[PDB]
Design a protein around this ligand. Structure first.
Ligand SMILES: O=C(O)c1cccnc1
Length: 378
């Protein structure tokens, strides 16, 4: 038996299965394909040992330690919540082991709290806020209100949206901010506070379980009528689909219009996923698939599992995905994975995105010289 290459993956399987179950389907698909094609480094099988974090930073770090000390994993991967990602990243820094963050979005993972051992796949809060702020900047309104879950992710998303919109439109004013605790939205009073401030536009960061509550209560109380809504992640099917015919219309969102992407590599992924799982993909599926693909490429290009070489190998490293080649920047360890921007609509009683475009991640990233200086000096 040849020794496996082992990846320790940690995620919120118990807390946000809407994302994490299709995500696991995606990374498992990638692993199966890699092993069927001969494995890595002369035939070594790729193995993922996965753990639940309960959506908790402490539990995630305990899991990381167990993966290292009981299973001798060669790298860590995953997480969903931004503060959980930050905790696992700091642990990885201390232990000098690769951590490939998949889904946590805060730009703090690559910038303010960036480190040698941490790389991150998905487009960050900054990146998605840049996409959305550029759209908001074209609207002939000035009065904005924000609503976001009150933890690292929501805080970063709102801070970046405000910064980027104000830079484009110095006359914009932010007339209200609402900060429900994650998964604990008190919809009535929150909606009323937004209405009271008489905004023209709303910027929303609620996702998952919080989103339908906000959509429904906003509608009941007339919050959305005559207002523009700009909303991070709302076009991702894991959040949009459960709303069914109550999906919001005309919102400007980031999301994943997988049903309408016609390019061959993406269709190949959709069909391989459907054949394997008998389910449609969600954005989590693409995230899982890309994460394990990128990691497999890193091991293969490194020629081994040794941590320092592995980390060096990822600098400016390209990897093929269902959306074409992506790379990890040497400067901030951020992948060039982008997102899709467009408007929500109903199609046959289901939420979809229309008038959308793919925005490559590089196009909304500051230059390497700029981001390098935002990282810790040691
Ligand atoms: O906390 C995060 O980074 C987060 C929130 C929603 C979706 N993906 C990531």
């Amino acid at each position: 038996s040849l020794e496996a290459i082992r990846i320790g993956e940690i995620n919120s399987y118990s807390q946000i299965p809407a994302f994490t179950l299709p995500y696991r389907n995606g990374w498992q698909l990638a692993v199966e394909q890699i092993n069927a094609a001969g494995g890595l480094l002369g035939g070594r099988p790729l193995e993922v040992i996965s753990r639940d974090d309960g959506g908790d930073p402490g539990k995630a770090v305990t899991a990381a330690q167990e993966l290292l000390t009981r299973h001798g994993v060669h790298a860590l991967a995953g997480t969903f919540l931004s503060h959980v990602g930050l905790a696992v990243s700091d642990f990885a820094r201390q232990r000098k082991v690769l951590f490939m963050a998949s889904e946590p979005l805060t730009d703090a993972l690559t910038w303010e709290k960036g480190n040698r051992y941490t790389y991150r796949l998905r487009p960050s809060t900054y990146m998605q806020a840049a996409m959305l702020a550029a759209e908001a900047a074209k609207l002939p309104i000035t009065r904005w209100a924000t609503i976001a879950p009150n933890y690292e992710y929501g805080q970063s998303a709102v801070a970046r949206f405000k910064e980027l919109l104000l830079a484009a439109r110095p006359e914009v004013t932010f007339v209200a901010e609402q900060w429900p605790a994650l998964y604990k939205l008190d919809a009535g009073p929150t909606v009323q506070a937004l209405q009271q401030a008489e905004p023209e536009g709303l910027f929303n960061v609620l996702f998952g379980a919080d989103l339908p509550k906000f959509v429904r209560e906003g509608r009941v109380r007339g919050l959305f009528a005559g207002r523009q809504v700009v909303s991070m992640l709302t076009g991702e099917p894991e959040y949009l689909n459960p709303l069914k015919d109550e999906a919001p219309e005309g919102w400007i969102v980031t999301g994943y219009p997988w049903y309408d992407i016609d390019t061959a590599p993406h269709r190949a992924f959709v069909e391989a996923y459907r054949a394997r799982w008998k389910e449609d993909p969600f954005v989590g599926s693409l995230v899982g698939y890309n994460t394990l693909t990128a990691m497999a490429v890193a091991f293969e290009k490194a020629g081994g599992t040794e941590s320092e070489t592995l980390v060096e190998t990822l600098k400016d490293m390209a990897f093929s995905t269902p959306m074409g080649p992506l790379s990890f920047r040497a400067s901030d360890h951020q992948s060039t994975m982008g997102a899709w921007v467009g408007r929500t609509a109903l199609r046959d009683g289901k939420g979809v995105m229309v008038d959308w475009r793919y925005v490559d991640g590089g196009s909304v990233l500051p230059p390497p010289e700029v981001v390098s200086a935002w990282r810790p000096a040691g």
